[PDB]
Amino acid sequence: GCGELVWVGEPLTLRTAETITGKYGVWMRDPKPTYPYTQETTWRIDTVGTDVRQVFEYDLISQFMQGYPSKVHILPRPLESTGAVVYSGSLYFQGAESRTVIRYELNTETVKAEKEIPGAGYHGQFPYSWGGYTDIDLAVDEAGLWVIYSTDEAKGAIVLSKLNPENLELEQTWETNIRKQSVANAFIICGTLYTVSSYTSADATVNFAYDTGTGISKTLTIPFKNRYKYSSMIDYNPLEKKLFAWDNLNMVTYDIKLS
Ligand SMILES: [Ca+2]
Ligand code: NA
């Protein structure tokens, strides 16, 4: 059931970090779970600092919400910022101080692929508006794995590329007219890129769309609430058909409706 985004619900807080290490971070579920994981498996990365390697894994939603991790993975290389995703059994993340995306297979704790995103700015060149070295933002939608970034050639405008999830080859690339540093974050639903206007406001909006199937850009005015005034991560999960976000220590989710 695909369509255009027409509504975002109120943010629901599922867990609150208890230390400054979790002021910003990323939390996610796999929209294509593979053994031994399930649709309930949740991963959480607290991303404050300069040597971020701990990935908290929870087998059950109850554990993610109330308990300790079931397992902690120590990444073999530090991770950059909040843009990572989990897809079909692998964590896809950006290496610290690099434009390299790394595929880390969770069940074997093995790096399976690495790829420099060609021409991508990194480490504060084309972050989202809050900073945080958010230059490179991975995304999963109904069609698979994507990466959101910018390049000098694009003059800081959002570029998005479809990625091969096995070897990280770029399969197709689109260039928008949206200055990446002018929006708070972005995500992809059914092949359409959406942006959020502000990371602090209770009265933000989903303010732009770019449809990769048609090439058409639109302006939107869909209300979006940053309940805690500092959203560092906003992603879409196509299995749950919900937004997952990290807002000033709080792991939150938003329902949506599509046309
Ligand atoms: Ca995002
Ligand atoms: Na992301």
Report whether 235 belongs to an annotated binding site: yes
Q: What is the layout of strands, in order, in the sheet containing 217-224?
A: 185-189, 192-196, 204-211, 217-224
Q: Is 148 helix (H, G, I), strand (E, B) or coil?
A: strand
Distance CA 193, CA 95 (A): 24
Q: Tokens representing 238?
A: 């196509």
Ligand 2 centre to CA of 66 (Å) is 24
Distance CA 16, CA 164 (A): 34
Listed residue (222, 11, 26, 31) closest to 134, CA to CA: 26
Report whether 189 belongs to an annotated binding site: no
Query: Which ligand is nearest the CA of 47, by number?
Result: 2
Query: Which ligand is nearest the CA of 139, by number?
Result: 2
**In which element (H, E) is residue 144 found?**
strand 144-149
Q: Tokens representing 155?
A: 């003059």
Cα end-to-end span (Å), the chain:
9
Report whether 146 contacts 161 (CB < 8 A). Answer: yes
Q: Is 236 helix (H, G, I), strand (E, B) or coil?
A: strand
Q: Is 32 helix (H, G, I), strand (E, B) or coil?
A: coil
Ligand 2 centre to CA of 237 (Å) is 10
Q: Tokens representing 96?
A: 């610290």
Distance CA 99, CA 119 (A): 8
Report whether 256 belongs to an annotated binding site: no
Cα 195-42-247 angle, rounded to 5 deg? 40
Instruction: Give me the helices (H) in 41-85, please.
Output: 61-66
Distance CA 232, CA 134 (A): 9
Listed residue (143, 205, 192) closest to 3, CA to CA: 192
DSSP 153-221: TTTTEEEEEEE-TTT--EEEEEEEEEEGGGSSEEEEETTEEEEES-SS-TTEEEEEEEETTT--EEEEE
Ligand 2 centre to CA of 232 (Å) is 10
Report whether 148 belongs to an annotated binding site: no
Distance CA 104, CA 119 (A): 23
Report whether 235 contacts 147 (CB < 8 A). Answer: no
Q: Tokens representing 209?
A: 């769309």
Query: Which ligand is nearest the CA of 128, by number?
Result: 1
Query: Which ligand is nearest the CA of 26, by number?
Result: 2
Listed residue (17, 63, 66, 74) closest to 40, CA to CA: 63
Ligand 1 centre to CA of 47 (Å) is 15
Ligand 2 centre to CA of 138 (Å) is 4
Q: Is 66 helix (H, G, I), strand (E, B) or coil?
A: helix
The 8-class DSSP code of residue 73 comes to: E
Q: Tokens representing 73?
A: 């993975």
Ligand 2 centre to CA of 135 (Å) is 11
Listed residue (24, 3, 52) closest to 230, CA to CA: 24
Ligand 1 centre to CA of 254 (Å) is 14
Cα 90-124-55 angle, rounded to 5 deg? 30
Distance of CA 229 to the CA centre of its chain: 18
Q: Is 57 helix (H, G, I), strand (E, B) or coil?
A: strand
Ligand 1 centre to CA of 68 (Å) is 26
DSSP 81-136: SS--EEETTEEEEEBTTSSEEEEEETTTTEEEEEEE-TTB--SSSS--TT-TT---
Resolution (A): 1.5
Ligand 2 centre to CA of 214 (Å) is 23
Report whether 102 belongs to an annotated binding site: no
Distance CA 11, CA 14 (A): 9
Residue 22 sits at φ, ψ, to 5 deg, of: -105, 25
Query: Which ligand is nearest the CA of 194, by number?
Result: 1
105: left (phi over 0), alpha (psi -120 to 50) or beta: beta
The 8-class DSSP code of residue 79 comes to: B
Distance of CA 43 to the CA centre of its chain: 12
Distance CA 256, CA 77 (A): 35
